[PDB]
Design a protein around this ligand. Structure first.
Ligand SMILES: CC(=O)N[C@@H](CCCCNC(=O)C[C@@H](C)Sc1ccc(Cl)c(Cl)c1)C(=O)N[C@H](C(N)=O)[C@@H](C)O
Ligand SMILES: [Zn+2]
Length: 288
């Protein structure tokens, strides 16, 4: 066939990546790339906040009237350390190797930035804790994560120093639209992509999940995930890993860290990746 992968395996993807045909990689990532960092999947299975209903703690209208439950939940689930995973540093290596067009992330945990992806490299489709803003439209003072953490830990509701309005993390609450950046980057990036690397997402949250259908028909798509995902739903109506018509989609099933290690090893990057992770982890462990 005219297909770009010589075989539908991780080995086939690595050979394609190091061929002249593969210049621009888009990563699509979800909570599975951060579970080994101790960040919980807010959407996965596994009280004192006295909400009118459970979903209120993540809705924008409620947050603006009663922000204390959200910031109480924030301190409770606040991670004791922000250490990106092997997967995050694999994407930094892609950037270093000149291969990363964009990382679209479902995650709000900031680990992509800590691992060295820059604003231009990222589409934080669901927002982020990395910056926060005064909610007053005429003010919009920006506050960094260090300022917000101090307010959350001292259990003081964060208020703007300029105008005393509430300060909200730049997360997309329910009732808010996705950032315009998501749609503007999608319209351009998918004209240019040679490889989709889908890591740690089961492609269940829309419109993010629809990004896989924006790839050109020839673009190979590798899923690294604990479970197979992204296939067409036999009910509702996609990834085709297993039919006789399959030609470009590959599933590597396991922990995201181990899949990225396996791919890096095939690429000849295992020592580079180990050295990067050990150095960055050491630096984070040594923060004083
Ligand atoms: C306008 C629109 O499209 N919004 C989408 C959802 C977009 C944001 C989803 N953010 C996440 O996943 C991030 C996770 C960490 S959870 C989270 C959520 C809020 C907060 Cl505040 C916090 Cl801290 C954590 C939407 O509602 N999609 C629906 C769906 N079920 O796919 C349906 C309409 O298609
Ligand atoms: Zn303000």
């Amino acid at each position: 066939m005219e297909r770009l992968l010589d075989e539908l395996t991780l080995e086939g993807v690595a050979r394609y990546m190091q061929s002249e045909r593969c210049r621009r990689v888009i990563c699509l990532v979800g909570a599975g790339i951060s579970t080994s960092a101790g960040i919980p999947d807010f959407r996965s299975p596994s009280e004192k906040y006295h909400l009118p209903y459970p979903e209120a703690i993540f809705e924008i209208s409620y947050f603006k009237k009663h922000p204390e439950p959200f910031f109480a939940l924030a301190k409770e689930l606040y991670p004791g350390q922000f250490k990106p995973t092997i997967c995050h540093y694999f994407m930094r290596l892609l950037k270093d190797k000149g291969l990363l067009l964009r990382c679209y992330t479902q995650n709000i945990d900031t680990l992509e930035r800590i691992a060295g992806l820059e604003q231009e490299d990222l589409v934080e489709a669901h927002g982020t804790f990395y910056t926060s803003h005064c909610v007053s439209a005429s003010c919009r003072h920006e506050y960094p994560l260090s300022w917000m953490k101090e307010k959350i830990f001292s259990e003081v509701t964060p208020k703007c120093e300029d105008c005393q309005s509430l300060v909200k993390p730049d997360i997309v609450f329910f009732g808010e639209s996705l950032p315009a950046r998501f749609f503007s980057c999608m319209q351009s990036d998918f004209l240019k992509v040679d490889l989709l690397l889908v890591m740690g997402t089961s492609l269940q949250v829309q419109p993010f999940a629809s990004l896989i259908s924006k790839a050109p028909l020839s673009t190979p798509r590798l899923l690294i995930n604990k479970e197979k995902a992204g296939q067409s739903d036999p009910f509702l109506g996609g990834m085709d890993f297993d039919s006789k018509k399959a030609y470009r989609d590959v599933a590597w099933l396991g922990e995201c860290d181990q899949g990225c290690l396996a791919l890096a090893e095939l690429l000849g990057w295992k020592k580079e990746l180990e050295d990067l992770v050990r150095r960055e982890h050491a630096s984070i462990d040594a923060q004083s």
